[PDB]
Every structure is written in C-alpha cells, then in structure tokens.
Amino acid sequence: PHQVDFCHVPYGASHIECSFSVSFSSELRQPYKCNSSKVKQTLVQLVELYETKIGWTELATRYLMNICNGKWLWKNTRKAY
Amino acid sequence: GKDFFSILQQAEHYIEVLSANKTPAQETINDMHFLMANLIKGGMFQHK
Amino acid sequence: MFLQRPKPYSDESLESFFIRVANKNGYGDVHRFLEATKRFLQDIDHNGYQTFPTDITRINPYSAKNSSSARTASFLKLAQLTFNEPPELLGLAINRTNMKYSPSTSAVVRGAEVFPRSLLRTHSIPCCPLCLRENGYASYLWHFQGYEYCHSHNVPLITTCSCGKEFDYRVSGLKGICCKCKEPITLTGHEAACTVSNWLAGHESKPLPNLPKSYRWGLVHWWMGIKDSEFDHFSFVQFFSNWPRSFHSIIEDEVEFNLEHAVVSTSELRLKDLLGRLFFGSIRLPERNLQHNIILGELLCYLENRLWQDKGLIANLKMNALEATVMLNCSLDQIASMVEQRILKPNRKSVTDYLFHFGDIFCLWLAEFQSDEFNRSFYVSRW
Amino acid sequence: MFLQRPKPYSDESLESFFIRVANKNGYGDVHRFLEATKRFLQDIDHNGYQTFPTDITRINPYSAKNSSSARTASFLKLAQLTFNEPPELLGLAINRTNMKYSPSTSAVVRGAEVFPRSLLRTHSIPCCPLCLRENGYASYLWHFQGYEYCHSHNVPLITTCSGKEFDYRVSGLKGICCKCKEPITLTGHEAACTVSNWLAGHESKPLPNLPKSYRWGLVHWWMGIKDSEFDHFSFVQFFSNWPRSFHSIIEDEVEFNLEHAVVSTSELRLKDLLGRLFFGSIRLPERNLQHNIILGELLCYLENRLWQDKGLIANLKMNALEATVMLNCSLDQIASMVEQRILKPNRKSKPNSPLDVTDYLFHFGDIFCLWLAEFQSDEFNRSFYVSRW
Ligand SMILES: [Zn+2]
Ligand SMILES: [Zn+2]
Structure with a gap:
C-alpha cells in the first residue's frame, strides 16, 4: 500500500492553467509580539530607517520577480514550451 | 556571523550605520536586506 | 543553443573567452549570454541549474564554494554540447588545487600551471590596454600580482584610467572605452620588472632559471617569503644574477646569525631554530620536485656537503617527528612504524617531542x- | 685509507663499481676490499660499525632491511672521506622507495629512476659477456627483468655458460667460468630488442618517449593485463597503433563487464565495470598525466564519454576508498569535503554524519568533476591528455 501517484497532462489538453493569489501586506512594520517594548522600538525604527535609507525596491523587486516568472511553478517548467 | 539571530544582535549597530548621512557599505546593506526579508517571512525569534 | 567559437588562444582568461563568445554569436552584453547558458543548463537537466554564475566576475570555479564541481561539470557540458567544434573551455578556468605552497598557503591551477593563492588579484584586475585593442582578448596573467608589465609591450598594466577611475575588462567589454567617459583608454626600474614579467609567462630571461611556469610563481612566492612583503623585481633579478652565490650567502648569513644568537646550547639546538625559515619555507613550492624546486635543491645540496663540518653540528640538529613527516613525505603513523621497526634512532627510549636528529633523517x-x-641525483649534478 | 676510482660510469651497478675500484688500488679480491672498508669504518665512529655487509651481493640498501639508513650514511662517509675526487657512490645504489606502483607493489630507486620491485631479478642476474669484456663494468639494467637484450649489442643476455650459473658479483667482471677456466665466448628477437633498448632511455618509435621511470611502469602494467609473462611482441604491437589499441581494449572491457553485469545499471559500480583498468593504472609510478600515458588515455576516454547513454559512465557508483585513490586525499579529508558539501552523498546519513568509508555513495562523474x-x-x-592524439 505505498500508493504512488501520477499526474500527467491529459491527452487532448491544449494547455494548463495554474492559478493562485499572493497578498503582500504591511505586517512587518510592527512585531506581532514583544514582551519587552525596548526591543520593539529598535525593530520598528529599524524598519523605518531601512525603508527611508534603502527603499523597498530591492526586496519588492526580488519578490515580484519570483511571482512574475514561473518560479512558484517549481519543476513544472523544466519541459515547457 | 551571517545567520539571522547574529545580525539581529547587531540591530543597534545597523540603526546608527543607516542613520549616518553617508551611504553604508554594500555588504552591510546585504546583511540588512537579509534581515528585512527574514522579518517579511515572519516567525518566532524567541529564546525560552 | 548552438554557438561558434572565435580563434581560440592559449593564454586567454576564461572571462575574456566568455566575452568574446557572447559578443560573437548573438548577444549584446555578456551578462545576457550567462543567463542564456543558465537557461541552457536548465533545458538539458543538470546540476549547474542552480549555481551557474551570471555575474562575470565569478565565473572561474575558484569563486564558487562547494559548487566548483558543478561549475566544472557545466563547463564540460558546454564544451561538447554548444559549439560547432569543441573549444578548450575548461583549460582556461582558474580553479582550486589541493597542493599548497611552502608556508601554509593554498594554490589555484589554470591549465597545466598552478599559481599560489597569495597573489591572485581578488579585485581590481589590471589590463594591457594596447594588448586589449590589438589581440582582442584578456590574457590570464593579468590576474596575478607578479605580472606588472606586459611581456609583449613592456608597458605597466593600466589598472585605472582617467575616464574610469578603476577599470577591468570583465565589465568593459574587451574594448577601449572607460566606464564613465566613452573614449580610448590607451594611456602609457622598468626593465628590472619587464624581464620578470616576461619570465612569468612561459619564456626565458637571462638571470632567471628555466623552471616550469608552475615553479616560477613558486620562486616569486618564496621571495616574498624572504622579503617579508613587497615583491620587488629588481632584488629578485639581481638575486638570480649571482644564483649559486647569493643563495649560499643567504643560507650562510641566516645560519651563522642563528648559531650565535641561539639562546640554548648546541646539542639541544633544533632545526626549526637553525635553518628554521628557509628549510620549511622552501620544502613545498609547487612540489618538492628537486629538479624544478631549485631552492630546496640548492639548500639540500649545501646541507649535504656540510653535513659533517663542525662536530656534525648540522647533522645533530633535533627535529621533531612531525618535522620528519615534512622533511620526507610520510605520516606520523608511518614514521612511528619505522621507529618501532628500529629504522630511526629515537635517541631517548620510552610523539611530537624532538627525538630525532637531522643527519639520521637525511640519510x-x-x-x-x-x-x-x-x-x-637532481641536485648533486648541478653547479 | 685512501682510494681512487677509474672512469666513473653513470650506468653501472654498485657492485661493479666496487669491483673495479677494488681491483684498481690494492685488492686482488673484492671481499678483502669490503672487509678493509668495514675496518676503516670500524676505527671511525659510525653506526655501520655493526651491520655493514661483507657479502657483495647484499650491499644495495634495498637488501639492507632495518638498516638502509646506516648504510647510506656509510656510503656518503666514503664518498667524501676515501677518494681523491668524490665518487658518485650513493647515486648507483638501488634502494627502497616509499612510493608504490599500481596494485600494491613497492618500488626501488636508482639515481633518478624508480623501478617496480616486481621485476628485480632477486637472483641469478644475467650478463652481457660481450658488453662485460668490452666495457669492464656491469650496467644496472642487467638486474631488471625487462632488460633481457643488450641495447648496445643486439645480443640476448646470458645467465649460464656451458659456468652453469654465471654472475658478475662472483666472477669478477671477466670472461672466466665457474667450474672451468675459459672465456664465456658464446652468443622474436627483433621485437625484444626494441623493448630492451627503449627500456634504457632511448627512442624506439613504436614506444612512447616517456621518462625512463614511467617505462618500467608501463612494463609492470602490461604484466598486469596479461596476468604474467611479459613478452615483447605483445608490447610492441599494443603500442604500434597506440591511440587505437588501448581504445579497443578499454571499449571491449567496458562492453564485456556491462553485458555480463550481475547488477542493474542504476547500481552498477566502477569497481566491477572498468575496475581492473582504472584502479590498475592510477599510479603506475605516479599519476603524472604527461608521463602516465595509460591513465591519461583512460581518463581521456572516460571524459569523452561521461554522458553518453543517460549518464552510463557518469552515474557509476564509487566508494570513499576509491575517491581517495582517484584523487589524492585521505578519507578524513574526504570527510571534510563531504561535511562542506563539496561532495554529493546521494544517500542521507541524517544523524550527526557517521562517515561510512566503504558504502558506494558517490557518482564517478561527480568525482571526476x-x-x-x-x-x-x-x-x-x-590539460596534459586533452591536447593529445
Ligand atoms: Zn599587452
Ligand atoms: Zn652488451
């Protein structure tokens, strides 16, 4: 009962859609918990000063690149037209 | 010294390194990029 | 894909090769060609899938850590799967090597010739702008801290122009245009270094020996070993101007000073004390091939002739077992097996303690x- | 005492040198000569005071077991304390070497050239009586099982005369017999002459121009292929069409061990498929790929066919104790390479890395790379082999 599975594209299938939904959100601005506010300040200020000095464009770009090229389609693009 | 909790131990240092009017080194902004991405991933940075 | 290779040279840096194969087949900038080859290694399944480099500064396998195997696999595949006729693409790659240079320093091999890591130009690699414009490729020798003049033009290598306050072909494009201002880059003890740089390439120079171009860099690194830093070519060429004389004077002068300035008396004197730096700083260069490692050859010749001069002061120099394992390539295991078999003479009965002389170990x-x-037999029939 | 040497020949046995220096100065017999030098080192302080041999046959320090160091010391002491001009004495002494040949066989160095012990003629060394009488010295080559023809005279080396066992160490470098007093006047030849000539540093164009040390490696290797019985015609023919003959041999061996492989391909190892050839050519005298021509061609062949049939050669199972010999390093250095993940241990040893040095764990292609x-x-x-034929 090892039950190995096999998912292959059906015969006449023209192509294959892969849908998902990714949500970016500003939940990194404030730590979800800090039992010591003294460290919460040095992280919210860390985030603020990061954003001011080196803007979000690098992390945002490196995320949106993985979104916009097929990289979430992990191996399903090795043999794709 | 390039894990997460090590470069978090130096967050106070990074605050003043950014706060200077001069631009910081490339390696230190790489460290802070990794630190920010590790916050974006979120998680539990605790020691019980 | 399918590419054609340009007029393959022997002494041409790998990055230079990728530049002149990118700008030959279909690509505008070499970076695009690196992404193209990465996509290629995606298409055909591989392991360079992940770690194949797209920045040109880090193509040579010595750049990747724990991925050099994969990058050489990648170069192998490229060489026989992507060209009309196969190029010698892997021979140009500067990759690590297991062999060391004499004092605890690693080495990198290219083609058939292994260089010390001590002089590799981790950054800011110079160029011969003229040679760039004529030949159209970047010679590999520019990467090493000995080659300070173009052996073909006797010009100092331009490391920084006026338009480009620091320049390198790995971003330039094998053409004479600076980073900021688009214009020809060509600007500009000269001979005391020109001969050394010409001898660093496989060539001959009157004062310097005809060693293999792997042992020439060994000589250079050893010289920097004596001259605590600051490799200058003049002292080198004059030191090889009187070759059997100068080095014999050096070992005499170092050996005599050690014997007076020794703090402990003669019988317990050790050979890392007397002849300490020369002996172990020459023992492994490219390798102890006594025919090529001319330094260890001469040192062993001088020591053998004077083995018994003053109470056998040389011969009865205590060297620890671990130094015997260096004097002759061996394991502490094997010298242990030798001394319990009674091959060697551990003067006091009963392992890293000094219990053996030099003479009994030399013989x-x-x-x-x-x-x-x-x-x-390689050094006895010398000068 | 003070001695002088005649016409120092570089290609000469140590025993022959001692013979022609014993007869030259004052000694009618060499035994007295060696005895005299033993006493000369007796009154001198030395450690050869004890173990110095008086038998001529056992002077070469490879015969000296547990005492070669003292005898080499004695040789130097004589070379600078007993002659008008320093004799090239230690240069002719065939002695032990730490280095080895391909399957677990020790080696003997003479001068610059190292030979496999397996072909040393432990006894009954022949002679070229024409060469002996004409020259007056016995070359070292007469000691080795390869030199059975004289490269100088095209005459096969004789061992026994009609003197039923002739030996130069017991004759005295003259044409005289053991049980009779007369000269020694007596005597696929052509296939052997080329080999025996090429065995001394020379050129026999069907044979490669390798360093004379790797030539004996070639001969020992050929003895390895045909389990024994090194005969010269097989050698010269195998090297007649050299970029073709070894190719055919390795092709046929890999095809044979593939066809009759008792294992599937995904588990096919390198030890069985292509086992005797590779691990039998990896260190003929040492793995210099410019000289070790057979390892060079085997590696060229394997590289040119690394990925031929879905990685047949490439995915060949290799054990740590085979990685340590394909590329010089100790299994502890391999441990350091595999904890650094420079290696690819295709199977996971989850807890704390218990290094198993015997289980087939790496792929050959990923070890070639x-x-x-x-x-x-x-x-x-x-780069030594790729730029070849
Ligand atoms: Zn130039
Ligand atoms: Zn003869």
Missing part, C-alpha cells in the same frame, strides 16, 4: 624515501 |  630520506623527482 | 576542480594538482592535470 633516512636518502635510503627509504627518495622519490622519482624528490630525488638526490 | 571534483577532480577537475579542487584536486587538479601540478602534473595530475587534465
């Missing part, structure tokens, strides 16, 4: 460890 |  190397090239 | 970077040493270099 031991003569008897039971004289290798093919680590061989006595 | 690991040799191509991280281990391409000075002469064990790829």
Whole structure:
C-alpha cells in the first residue's frame, strides 16, 4: 500500500492553467509580539530607517520577480514550451 | 556571523550605520536586506 | 543553443573567452549570454541549474564554494554540447588545487600551471590596454600580482584610467572605452620588472632559471617569503644574477646569525631554530620536485656537503617527528612504524617531542624515501 | 685509507663499481676490499660499525632491511672521506622507495629512476659477456627483468655458460667460468630488442618517449593485463597503433563487464565495470598525466564519454576508498569535503554524519568533476591528455 501517484497532462489538453493569489501586506512594520517594548522600538525604527535609507525596491523587486516568472511553478517548467 | 539571530544582535549597530548621512557599505546593506526579508517571512525569534 | 567559437588562444582568461563568445554569436552584453547558458543548463537537466554564475566576475570555479564541481561539470557540458567544434573551455578556468605552497598557503591551477593563492588579484584586475585593442582578448596573467608589465609591450598594466577611475575588462567589454567617459583608454626600474614579467609567462630571461611556469610563481612566492612583503623585481633579478652565490650567502648569513644568537646550547639546538625559515619555507613550492624546486635543491645540496663540518653540528640538529613527516613525505603513523621497526634512532627510549636528529633523517630520506623527482641525483649534478 | 676510482660510469651497478675500484688500488679480491672498508669504518665512529655487509651481493640498501639508513650514511662517509675526487657512490645504489606502483607493489630507486620491485631479478642476474669484456663494468639494467637484450649489442643476455650459473658479483667482471677456466665466448628477437633498448632511455618509435621511470611502469602494467609473462611482441604491437589499441581494449572491457553485469545499471559500480583498468593504472609510478600515458588515455576516454547513454559512465557508483585513490586525499579529508558539501552523498546519513568509508555513495562523474576542480594538482592535470592524439 505505498500508493504512488501520477499526474500527467491529459491527452487532448491544449494547455494548463495554474492559478493562485499572493497578498503582500504591511505586517512587518510592527512585531506581532514583544514582551519587552525596548526591543520593539529598535525593530520598528529599524524598519523605518531601512525603508527611508534603502527603499523597498530591492526586496519588492526580488519578490515580484519570483511571482512574475514561473518560479512558484517549481519543476513544472523544466519541459515547457 | 551571517545567520539571522547574529545580525539581529547587531540591530543597534545597523540603526546608527543607516542613520549616518553617508551611504553604508554594500555588504552591510546585504546583511540588512537579509534581515528585512527574514522579518517579511515572519516567525518566532524567541529564546525560552 | 548552438554557438561558434572565435580563434581560440592559449593564454586567454576564461572571462575574456566568455566575452568574446557572447559578443560573437548573438548577444549584446555578456551578462545576457550567462543567463542564456543558465537557461541552457536548465533545458538539458543538470546540476549547474542552480549555481551557474551570471555575474562575470565569478565565473572561474575558484569563486564558487562547494559548487566548483558543478561549475566544472557545466563547463564540460558546454564544451561538447554548444559549439560547432569543441573549444578548450575548461583549460582556461582558474580553479582550486589541493597542493599548497611552502608556508601554509593554498594554490589555484589554470591549465597545466598552478599559481599560489597569495597573489591572485581578488579585485581590481589590471589590463594591457594596447594588448586589449590589438589581440582582442584578456590574457590570464593579468590576474596575478607578479605580472606588472606586459611581456609583449613592456608597458605597466593600466589598472585605472582617467575616464574610469578603476577599470577591468570583465565589465568593459574587451574594448577601449572607460566606464564613465566613452573614449580610448590607451594611456602609457622598468626593465628590472619587464624581464620578470616576461619570465612569468612561459619564456626565458637571462638571470632567471628555466623552471616550469608552475615553479616560477613558486620562486616569486618564496621571495616574498624572504622579503617579508613587497615583491620587488629588481632584488629578485639581481638575486638570480649571482644564483649559486647569493643563495649560499643567504643560507650562510641566516645560519651563522642563528648559531650565535641561539639562546640554548648546541646539542639541544633544533632545526626549526637553525635553518628554521628557509628549510620549511622552501620544502613545498609547487612540489618538492628537486629538479624544478631549485631552492630546496640548492639548500639540500649545501646541507649535504656540510653535513659533517663542525662536530656534525648540522647533522645533530633535533627535529621533531612531525618535522620528519615534512622533511620526507610520510605520516606520523608511518614514521612511528619505522621507529618501532628500529629504522630511526629515537635517541631517548620510552610523539611530537624532538627525538630525532637531522643527519639520521637525511640519510633516512636518502635510503627509504627518495622519490622519482624528490630525488638526490637532481641536485648533486648541478653547479 | 685512501682510494681512487677509474672512469666513473653513470650506468653501472654498485657492485661493479666496487669491483673495479677494488681491483684498481690494492685488492686482488673484492671481499678483502669490503672487509678493509668495514675496518676503516670500524676505527671511525659510525653506526655501520655493526651491520655493514661483507657479502657483495647484499650491499644495495634495498637488501639492507632495518638498516638502509646506516648504510647510506656509510656510503656518503666514503664518498667524501676515501677518494681523491668524490665518487658518485650513493647515486648507483638501488634502494627502497616509499612510493608504490599500481596494485600494491613497492618500488626501488636508482639515481633518478624508480623501478617496480616486481621485476628485480632477486637472483641469478644475467650478463652481457660481450658488453662485460668490452666495457669492464656491469650496467644496472642487467638486474631488471625487462632488460633481457643488450641495447648496445643486439645480443640476448646470458645467465649460464656451458659456468652453469654465471654472475658478475662472483666472477669478477671477466670472461672466466665457474667450474672451468675459459672465456664465456658464446652468443622474436627483433621485437625484444626494441623493448630492451627503449627500456634504457632511448627512442624506439613504436614506444612512447616517456621518462625512463614511467617505462618500467608501463612494463609492470602490461604484466598486469596479461596476468604474467611479459613478452615483447605483445608490447610492441599494443603500442604500434597506440591511440587505437588501448581504445579497443578499454571499449571491449567496458562492453564485456556491462553485458555480463550481475547488477542493474542504476547500481552498477566502477569497481566491477572498468575496475581492473582504472584502479590498475592510477599510479603506475605516479599519476603524472604527461608521463602516465595509460591513465591519461583512460581518463581521456572516460571524459569523452561521461554522458553518453543517460549518464552510463557518469552515474557509476564509487566508494570513499576509491575517491581517495582517484584523487589524492585521505578519507578524513574526504570527510571534510563531504561535511562542506563539496561532495554529493546521494544517500542521507541524517544523524550527526557517521562517515561510512566503504558504502558506494558517490557518482564517478561527480568525482571526476571534483577532480577537475579542487584536486587538479601540478602534473595530475587534465590539460596534459586533452591536447593529445
Ligand atoms: Zn599587452
Ligand atoms: Zn652488451
């Protein structure tokens, strides 16, 4: 009962859609918990000063690149037209 | 010294390194990029 | 894909090769070609899938850590799967090597020639702008901290222009245009270094020996070993101007000073004390091939002739077992097996304690460890 | 006492040198000569005071067991304390070497050239009586099982006369018999003459122009292929069409061990498929790929066919104790390479890395590539074979 599975594209299938939904959100601005506010300040200020000095464009770009090229389609693009 | 909790131990240092009017080194902004991405991933940075 | 290679040169840096194969087939900038080859290694399944480099500064396998195997696999595949006729693409790659240079320093090999890591130009690699414009490729020698003049033009290598306050072909494009201002880059003890740089390439120079171009860099690194830093070519060429004389004077002067300035008396004097830096700073260069490692050759010749001069002061120099394992390539295991078999004479009965002399170990190397090239007959029939 | 040497020949046995220096100065017999030098080192302080041999046959320090160091010391002491001009004495002494040949066989160095012990003629060394009488010295080559023809005279080396066992160490370098007093006047030849000539540093164009040390490696290797019985015609024919003959041999061996492989391909190892050839050519005298021509061609062949049939050669199972010999390093250095993940241990040893050095764990292709970077040493270099025929 090892039950190995096999998912292959059906015969006449023209192509294959892969849908998902990714949500970016500003939940990194404030730590979800800090039992010591003294460290919460040095992280919210860390985030603020990061954003001011080196803007979000690098992390945002490196995320949106993985979104916009097929990289979430992990191996399903090795043999794709 | 390039894990997460090590470069978090130096967050106070990074605050003043950014706060200077001069631009910081490339390696230190790489460290802070990794630190920010590790916050974006979120998680539990605790020691019980 | 399918590419055609341009007029392959022998002494042409790998990055230079990728530049002149990118800008030959279909690509505008070489970076695009690196992404193209990465996509290629995606298409055909591979392991360079992940770690194949897209920045040109880090193509040579010595750049990747724990991925050099994959990058050489990648170059192998590229060489026989992507060209009309196969190029010698892997021979140009500067990759690591297992062999060291004498004092605890690693080495990188390219083609058939292994360089010390001590002089590799981790950054800011110069160029011969003229040679760039004529030949159209970047010679590999520019990467090493000995080659300070173009052996073909006797010009100092331009490391920084006026338009480009620091320049390198890895971003330039094998053409004379600076980073900021688009214009020809060509600007500009000269001979005391030109001969050294010409001899660093496979060539001959009157004062310097005709060693293999792997042992020339060994000589250079050893010289920087004596001259605590600051490799200058003039002292080098004059030191090889009187070759059997200067080095003999050096070992005499170092050896005599050690014997007076020694703080402990003669019988317990050790050989890392007397002849400490020369002996172990020459023992492994490219390798102890006594025919090529001219330094260890001369040192062993001088020591053998004076082995018994003053109470055998040389011969009865205490060297620890671990130094015998260096004097003759061996394991502490094997010298242990030798001394319990009664091959060696551990003067006091009963392992890293100094219990053996130099003479009994030198004759031991003569008897039971004289290798093919680590061989006595190479230096005895010398000057 | 004070001695002088006649016409020092470089290609001469140590015993022959001692003979022609014993007869030259004051000694009618060599035994008295060696005895005299033993006493000369007796009154001198030395450690050869004890173990110095008086038998001529056992002077070469490879015969000296546990005492070669003292005898080499004695040889130097004589070379600078007993002659008008320093004699090339230690240069002719065939002695032990730490280095080995391909399957577990020790080696003997003479001068610059190292030979496999397996072909040493432990006894009954022949002679070229024409060469002996004409020259007056016995070359070292007469000691080795390869030199059975004289490269100088095209005459086969004689061992026994009609003197039923002739030996130069017991004759005295003259044409005289053992049980009779007369000269020694007596005597696929052509296939053997080329080999025996090429065995001394020379040129026999069907044979490669390798260093004379790797030539004996070639001969020992050929003895390895045909389990024994080194005969010269097979050698010269195998090297007649050299870029073709060894290719055919390795092709046929890989095809045979593939066809009759008792294992599937995904588990097919390198030890069985292509086992005797590779691990039998990896260190003929040492793995210099410019000289070690057979390892060079085997590696060229394997590289040119690394990925031929879905990685047949490439995915060949290799054990740590085979990685340590394909590319010089100790299994502890391999442990350091595999904890650094420079290696690819296709199977997971989850807890704390218990290094099993015997289980077939790596792929040959991924070890060939690991040799191509991280281990391409000075002469064990790829660029030596690729730019060949
Ligand atoms: Zn130039
Ligand atoms: Zn003869």
